[PDB]
């Protein structure tokens, strides 16, 4: 199977530098035409830079918005490319996708986020929400940057779950999740909220207790 | 530049029915070599974009032939016969004849019967209170259609400052939507009041759908 | 348009 | 212990700063309180040379343009005001545990952009009378590094029996050079007369072309 | 002046044995922690073995992949150490560096090449490349193993020289060199290519003739 | 980490 795996994303100060990478497998990479494409609310999908075939001498081209600041790089022997960014701007903030193939934009990776901000990283408060058959919740409040991953019972609880997209508020994010189970299930069975925040290397468990 | 314009913005469709999407370019996509580089993509919820069609009408490998593209010059259409649930998402066109540009996208909505929200209210956790903050949360789950109006009322009086709303994409599974509303207050005004009410007005109910608690000082 | 690959 | 070094290639302008990462698969902090993480530079045609030991100590002779930082599993080499003589392959290494090295990071110096000077050479009398035939093409002082060479015999492309070799970047002018050798039997060589070396490079859409004719 | 100079490498057949040596000067050898470190296209840099100070009783350690086949030894009175390698295999092929100091890996020699084999050592043919300002060439074809040394006018001509790395096809290397000079330089001034292939004991000068 | 030389003990 073809996989494009981005890596190296995160929080950067305006004016700062950052490198992201894309590791490819499942196809003959030297044959592949590769792109970086970013996504944002304030602009939707945006082509950023491309790097052509070995056949085509690894020719590079950059979107005018990043020309001179961004350098695309590739290693066919290691099936890897990178994007090396300098003098980053708030407007560069986005999800950066790695894309390529013999056919071009044939495949896309899951993306890595690039957030350009002077706000500092902040771990989230995790709050258990007990109710007043039965719905429970978990409130993940006051973190930066994105993302977190939220899990119910270390992931083993996935039936009846709704996890909601984070929303930003005065330089901080909040997200929530609901889980619905039968009345015979809880409080008899332990249900706990698991939240990881990679940027703060934190991982917290909050058990939902009856109140 | 070359702006590509997608139309319509959303498209609701019943399962098994045909959907039609339009993409116009601010200029011809016909290249000096006779080729037209017009591609269609689908972004499903939580996933990155995936190539459907390249060079106007060529299905990339794996793309079911219910997906079909046609058009010339500045005028292009994506047709989706036999819409399945798993088709929902945002459909994008892009051109790469010139410096690559993308459309704004077109959301495909799957028409569904009709479903009332299950509403859940949660007072602030003792944990959050024992840190001098107060958030009241309301979940409104598994509803259709997507339009809904949520109000917070504190001692009967609507509060709109400090509200934080979040909705899911449509769920392929049952075609429904879900929403989360969070009212945040200082611990002080939280304690100054004791009736807390998450309201919500939806097609599926004649009167507001009420979920309330009273604080027992 | 622009110069394409071979 | 795995030392993962990033990026593979690092193009930087003269005077700019460059930053190189390596991360270890376990803490490099020894139970004795020391952190044994080292940085080396291997210039073209030379052996590795120690830059920094124990995270941040410059070895004797090393300018303070070069600085190391980090702790635990996460380390960085920074080079401010890069000069062309800085080019080459950087390696991190740890010896807290059984010694291991990172994969290397190649520092490349950014350059205006330059087309190759091309030269073609027929087989020597000496090789011919030994009954063999190599035709040689030199592509000198180009930038950037990617270039494509096509051999045409009597107008017709010939792509087997070609050996190519690139120099490392030359710190003197930041360019690369490239050599291409097409080898044929003497009899095959004497069966044709038009020999063409075509070089395609970023700097132009039309290949640079050098040729000779046995006639 | 600290110096570390490796000698003794070359071609051996798989299953064969070889000893390489390191000679040092410019420091108190007995105080230095020494290592052998090898480099190859595959694998890159790997630590191979070490031998500690006199103070640490010359304690020795080996990489896992050579443990039992390699033996590292030193002689502080001679400022020398060596590495005896047995049952060599293709994957032992590479450049071997002598390295050490009080700081460890403080200094590195130029290295020596260990090539494990099958192929038969072969003298190069050296051909001059005269042009069809002016650029000349030298072509060094069909040799084994590495290395050869190539110079122009005995190294006196270095401005405008590009010597390209040996490339291997089918058990034989070829390499080449170009020299670019001004028009009033050649052919009035003689320009010749000096090649040495130690392994086959060949020294040869090829004058570039118009 | 492995046993260091005596001057690093
Ligand atoms: C022409 O070149 C530009 C360079 O950014 C884009 O790659 C564009 O997509 C190319 N057009 C075609 C038809 O390949
Ligand atoms: C521990 O011993 C090993 C033996 O191979 C290495 O010498 C390693 O570098 C030593 N670690 C330290 C911190 O000296
Ligand atoms: Zn390249
Ligand atoms: Zn607590
Ligand atoms: Zn022929
Ligand atoms: Zn001894």
Q: Are strands B106-110 and B10-13 parallel, antiparallel or unpaired?
A: parallel
Phi and psi (nearest 5°) for D187?
-65, -40
Long-range contacts of B62-68 (CB under 8 A, 24+ apart): B67/B40
B191 and B207 assigned to the same domain: yes
Contacts of B61 (CB under 8 A, 6+ apart): none
D107 and D197 assigned to the same domain: no
D105 and D117 assigned to the same domain: no
> What are A189's two structure tokens?
């069975």
Which among A9, A31, A36 is positioned nearest to A79, based on CA atoms?
A: A31
What residues of C are in contact with residue A33 (Cβ under 8 Å)?
5
Q: Are strands A107-108 and A94-101 parallel, antiparallel or unpaired?
A: antiparallel
Give the single-character DSSP code of E170. Answer: T
**H or E element that contains B128:** helix B126-129
H helix and E strand count, chain A = 0, 19
Count residue pairs from B and C with Cβ separation < 8 A: 10
A147 by Cβ neighbours in 10 Å (0-12 / 13-18 / 19+) ranks as middle
CATH of residue B35's domain is: 2.60.40.10
Window 1-9 of F: residues touching D by CB (8 A cutoff) are: 1-2, 4, 8-9
- Contact status, residue B73 vs residue B29, Cβ threshold 8 Å: yes
Pocket-testing residue among B2, B25, B30, B96, ligand 1, by greatest number of atoms within 8 A of Cβ? B96
Give the single-character DSSP code of D97. Answer: S
Report the nearest-CA residue for atom 1 of ligand 1.
C2
D61 and D5 assigned to the same domain: yes
Q: What SS3 class is residue D60?
A: coil
What residues of D are in contact with residue F4 (Cβ under 8 Å)?
30, 32, 34
Phi and psi (nearest 5°) for A153?
45, 60
Give the single-character DSSP code of D178. Answer: E
Nearest to D124 among E45, E127, E165 (CB): E127
B73 and B140 assigned to the same domain: no
Distance from the Cα of residue A8 to its chain's centroid: 10
Q: Are strands A149-152 and A134-143 parallel, antiparallel or unpaired?
A: unpaired
**Residues written for chain F:** 9
What residues of F are in contact with residue E59 (Cβ under 8 Å)?
5
CA distances (Å), A10 to each of A95, A115, A146, in order?
10, 6, 8
Residue of D nearest to A58 (CA): D146
- Contact status, residue A157 vs residue A179, Cβ threshold 8 Å: yes
E120 by Cβ neighbours in 10 Å (0-12 / 13-18 / 19+) ranks as exposed
B38 and B96 assigned to the same domain: yes
Examine the fold and report which residue of B96, B112, B128 is the final residue of a domain before the chain moves on. B112
State how far the Cα of D30 lies from the Cα of B87, in Å rounded to an integer: 55
State how far the Cα of E137 lies from the Cα of E148, in Å rounded to an integer: 16
What residues of C are in contact with residue A56 (Cβ under 8 Å)?
5-6
CB atoms within 10 A of CB E132: 11
State how far the Cα of A62 lies from the Cα of D107, in Å rounded to an integer: 21
Please give, rounded to a whole number of angstroms, the shortest distance from the CA of E56 to a CA of chain F: 6
- Contact status, residue D35 vs residue D70, Cβ threshold 8 Å: no
Please give, rounded to a whole number of angstroms, the shortest distance from the CA of A99 to a CA of chain C: 17
Which residue in this structure is represented by tokens 């070609």?
Answer: D162
HSE-CB for D77 with a 13 A CA cutoff: 33
CA distances (Å), A119 to each of A90, A144, F3, in order?
11, 8, 44
Which among A182, A196, A191, A178 is positioned nearest to A139, based on CA atoms?
A: A178
> What are D6's two structure tokens?
């990033």
State how far the Cα of A21 lies from the Cα of A94, in Å rounded to an integer: 15
Whether the upstream peptide bond of residue B145 has omega within 30° of 0, thus cis, is: yes
- Contact status, residue A140 vs residue A101, Cβ threshold 8 Å: no
HSE-CB for D151 with a 13 A CA cutoff: 23
D116 and D207 assigned to the same domain: yes
State how far the Cα of D134 lies from the Cα of D152, in Å rounded to an integer: 14
CB atoms within 10 A of CB E40: 15
State how far the Cα of E164 lies from the Cα of E179, in Å rounded to an integer: 11
**Residues written for chain D:** 215
Q: What is the dihedral of CA E11, E16, E14, D93, to 10 degrees?
A: -70
- Contact status, residue B23 vs residue B103, Cβ threshold 8 Å: yes
B190 and B106 assigned to the same domain: no
Report the nearest-CA residue for atom 13 of ligand 2.
D96
> What are B182's two structure tokens?
């969070």
Where do the H-state alpha helices sit in A20-159? none
- Contact status, residue D14 vs residue D110, Cβ threshold 8 Å: yes
Examine the fold and report which residue of D77, D111, D145 is the final residue of a domain before the chain moves on. D111
State how far the Cα of D36 lies from the Cα of D20, in Å rounded to an integer: 17
B194 and B208 assigned to the same domain: yes
Domains of chain A by range and CATH?
1-118 (2.60.40.10), 119-211 (2.60.40.10)
> What are E14's two structure tokens?
């798989």
D69 and D11 assigned to the same domain: yes
Number of structural domains in chain B: 2
Which among D20, D36, D17 is positioned nearest to D28, based on CA atoms?
A: D36
State how far the Cα of A189 lies from the Cα of A102, in Å rounded to an integer: 52
Q: Are strands A107-108 and A167-169 parallel, antiparallel or unpaired?
A: unpaired
Which residue in this structure is represented by tokens 């290691």?
Answer: A78
Contacts of E59 (CB under 8 A, 6+ apart): E51, E52, F5
CB atoms within 10 A of CB A78: 12
B interface mutation test: which of C1, C2, C3, C4 has the most B CBs within 10 A?
C1
Give the single-character DSSP code of E98. Answer: E
Phi and psi (nearest 5°) for D202?
-35, -45
- Contact status, residue E179 vs residue E136, Cβ threshold 8 Å: yes
Instruction: Tell me, using a 6 A CB cutoff, whether residue E50 lines ligand 2.
Output: yes
Examine the fold and report which residue of D111, D127, D147 is the final residue of a domain before the chain moves on. D111
**Residues written for chain E:** 210
Buried b (16+ CB within 10 A) or exposed e, A176-211: bbbbbbeeebbeeeebbbbbebebeeeeeebebeee
Buried b (16+ CB within 10 A) or exposed e, D42-74: bbeeebbbbbbbebeebbeebeeebbbebeebe
Which among D94, D42, D31 is positioned nearest to D68, based on CA atoms?
A: D94
Distance from the Cα of residue D149 to its chain's centroid: 18
Taking the centre of ligand 1 as the mean of its atom positions, its distance from the CA of residue B96, in whole angstroms, is 6
Residues facing E21 on adjacent strands? E7, E82
D69 and D154 assigned to the same domain: no
For chain F, what is the radius of gyration of the CA atoms?
6
> What are D149's two structure tokens?
């060479």
B95 and B148 assigned to the same domain: no
For B52-102, the DSSP string reads EEETTTEEPTT--TTEEEEEETTEEEEEESS--GGG-EEEEEEE-SSS-EE
Please, do chains D and E touch (3+ CB pairs < 8 Å)? Answer: yes
> What are D175's two structure tokens?
């360019």
D18 is in which domain, residue-wise?
1-111
**Residues written for chain B:** 217
For E23-60, the DSSP string reads EEESS-GGG-EEEEEEEETTTEEEEEEEE--TTTTT-E
**Positive or negative CA dihedral for D137, D143, D148, D153?**
negative
Q: What SS3 class is residue F6?
A: helix
State how far the Cα of A76 lies from the Cα of D9, in Å rounded to an integer: 12
């Amino acid at each position: 199977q073809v996989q494009l795996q981005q890596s190296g994303g995160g929080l950067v100060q305006p004016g700062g530098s950052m490198k992201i990478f894309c590791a490819a497998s499942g196809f003959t990479f030297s044959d592949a035409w590769m792109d970086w494409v970013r996504q944002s609310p304030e602009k939707g999908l945006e082509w950023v830079a491309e790097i052509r075939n070995k056949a085509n001498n690894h020719e590079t081209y950059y979107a005018e918005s990043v020309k001179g600041r961004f350098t695309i790089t590739r290693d066919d022997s290691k099936s890897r490319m990178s994007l090396q960014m300098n003098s980053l701007r708030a407007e560069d903030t986005g999800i950066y996708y790695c894309s390529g193939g013999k056919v071009r934009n044939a495949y896309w990776g899951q993306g890595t986020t690039v957030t350009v901000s002077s706000k500092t990283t902040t771990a989230p408060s995790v709050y258990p929400l007990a109710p007043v058959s039965v719905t429970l919740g978990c409130l993940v409040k006051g973190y930066f940057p994105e993302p977190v991953t939220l899990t119910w019972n270390s992931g083993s609880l996935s039936s009846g779950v709704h996890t909601f997209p984070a929303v930003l508020q005065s330089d901080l994010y909040t997200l929530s999740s609901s889980v619905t189970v039968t009345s015979s299930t809880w409080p008899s069975q332990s249900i706990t909220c698991n939240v990881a925040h990679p940027a703060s290397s934190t991982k917290v468990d909050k058990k939902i207790e009856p109140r | 530049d070359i702006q590509l314009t997608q139309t319509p913005l959303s498209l609701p469709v019943s399962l098994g029915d045909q959907a039609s999407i339009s993409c116009r370019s601010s200029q011809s996509l016909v290249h000096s070599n006779g080729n037209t580089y017009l591609h269609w993509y689908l972004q499903k919820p939580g996933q990155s974009p995936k190539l459907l069609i390249y060079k106007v009408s060529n299905r990339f490998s794996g793309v079911p032939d219910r997906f079909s593209g046609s058009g010339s010059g500045t005028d292009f259409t994506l047709k989706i016969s036999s819409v399945e649930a798993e088709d929902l998402g945002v459909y994008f066109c892009s051109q790469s004849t010139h410096v690559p540009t993308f459309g704004g996208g077109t959301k495909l909505e799957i028409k569904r019967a009709d479903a009332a929200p299950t509403v859940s209210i949660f007072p602030p956790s003792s944990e959050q209170l024992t840190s001098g903050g107060a958030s009241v949360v309301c979940f409104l789950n598994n509803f259709y259609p997507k339009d809904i109006n949520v109000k917070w009322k504190i001692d009967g009086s609507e509060r709109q400052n400090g509200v934080l709303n979040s909705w899911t994409d449509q769920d392929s599974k049952d075609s429904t939507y879900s929403m989360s509303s969070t009212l945040t207050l200082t611990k002080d005004e939280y304690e100054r009041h004791n009736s807390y009410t998450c309201e919500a007005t939806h097609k599926t109910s004649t009167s507001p759908i009420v979920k309330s608690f009273n604080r027992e000082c | 348009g622009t110069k394409p690959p071979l």
